[PDB]
Amino acid sequence: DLSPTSLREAFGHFPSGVIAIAAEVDGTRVGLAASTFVPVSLEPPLVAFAVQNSSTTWPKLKDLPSLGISVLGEAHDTAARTLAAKTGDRFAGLETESRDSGAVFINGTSVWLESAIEQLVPAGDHTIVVLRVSDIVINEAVPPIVFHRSAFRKLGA
Amino acid sequence: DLSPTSLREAFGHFPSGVIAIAAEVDGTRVGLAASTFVPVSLEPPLVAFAVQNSSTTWPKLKDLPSLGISVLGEAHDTAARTLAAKTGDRFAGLETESRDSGAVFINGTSVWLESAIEQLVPAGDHTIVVLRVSDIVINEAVPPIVFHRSAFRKLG
Ligand SMILES: Cc1cc2nc3c(=O)[nH]c(=O)nc-3n(C[C@H](O)[C@H](O)[C@H](O)COP(=O)(O)O)c2cc1C
Ligand SMILES: Cc1cc2nc3c(=O)[nH]c(=O)nc-3n(C[C@H](O)[C@H](O)[C@H](O)COP(=O)(O)O)c2cc1C
């Protein structure tokens, strides 16, 4: 069928990394997890992800000047679920860095990308958010987590 | 450093699966490998990927009625490379099925997703292609290939 649960299950067979998208307002960290990160363009540098239109967190991020994207590492399985929590501290047991731009990054992750919204494209029950990348940090020693079939896996062979 | 080479390096640290996007035109299969597949919407059912604007294959696919997407499995490292090859038979070595709609699928993959173009969103040197899913089949729980840092990896 093309029902939401059946679609969700089928989509889950396609593996992908997971990001934290986060920023700080008045010293308070605001963020969410997304499995829909896409590296889009090199010139100019663009990325994208898809946000649920019903999100109550996204309205608190979308007007901020800069957002931090962190590609979660293979030990951040609990962190990924925690960043998705409806209630509770989404940054529990995490170490983070807040840049002067307000972008927030998670320490110990594979990649940090500082980003700014370029376009918002309505897409069914989500919105595709296209962002410009303004800064990059790579941590070569941290392999990434992979979200697949509802679970969090590490790369092997 | 925000040069193309620096971005390629950084972007390569993001792991993702690889899909075959394929169709048959006048008896000849046409396709490419993409690692930028993302699920977009459940209601209505939408997915997307990012296509290079300079692609010479995409113009052969973009006006077709229906495209086949197959998620590549861990045995398909060779298949992914071949489906990306700038010359030669991109389907060499593969078992495929072609539907009456023209959509083409790879046998031995976990999921077959049939779809048609919904929107084309310019995005720098790529275009984000939003597709409306018309049919989806889970064939079996075949473990996927993962593209990461220019290598084809399996899940541990
Ligand atoms: C592994 C995983 C991947 C997720 N991917 C997305 C996503 O790509 N887009 C999205 O809007 N929410 C995604 N979520 C949901 C959020 O992270 C979070 O649960 C949601 O934003 C919370 O509701 P709120 O924004 O109304 O506070 C994901 C959650 C998990 C656990
Ligand atoms: C693992 C892998 C992932 C790829 N992902 C994409 C992609 O997401 N988008 C894209 O336009 N090309 C992608 N390519 C490139 C194509 O598969 C192919 O090499 C290209 O379309 C060939 O050039 P042509 O379209 O001018 O024939 C990928 C190639 C490989 C090996």
From Swiss-Prot, chain B:
- Per the UniProt entry, the Enzyme Commission number(s) are 1.5.1.37, 1.5.1.42
GO biological process, alphabetically ordered: dibenzothiophene catabolic process
In alphabetical order, the GO MF annotations are: FMN binding; riboflavin reductase (NADPH) activity
Record pathway: Sulfur metabolism; dibenzothiophene degradation
Chemical reaction(s) catalysed: FMNH2 + NAD(+) = FMN + NADH + 2 H(+); FADH2 + NAD(+) = FAD + NADH + 2 H(+)
User: Where is it localised?
Assistant: Cytoplasm
Per UniProt, which keywords does this protein have? Answer: Cytoplasm, FAD, Flavoprotein, FMN, Nucleotide-binding, Oxidoreductase
InterPro entries membership: Flavin_Rdtase-like_dom (IPR002563), NADH-dep_flavin_reductase (IPR050268), Split_barrel_FMN-bd (IPR012349)
- Which positions form S-S bridges? none
**GO CC terms, sorted:** cytoplasm
> Per UniProt, where does FMN bind?
26, 33-36, 50-57, 84, 90, 147
Q: Which Pfam families match?
A: Flavin_Reduct (PF01613)
Cited function: An NADH:FMN oxidoreductase which supplies reduced FMN for the '4S' desulfurization pathway that removes covalently bound sulfur from dibenzothiophene (DBT) without breaking carbon-carbon bonds. Can also use FAD. Provides DszC and probably also DszA (DBT-monooxygenase and DBTO2-monooxygenase respectively) with reduced flavin (FMN and/or FAD).
Q: Belongs to which family? A: Belongs to the non-flavoprotein flavin reductase family.
By what name is this protein known?
NADH:FMN oxidoreductase
Source organism of the structure: Mycolicibacterium goodii (Mycobacterium goodii)
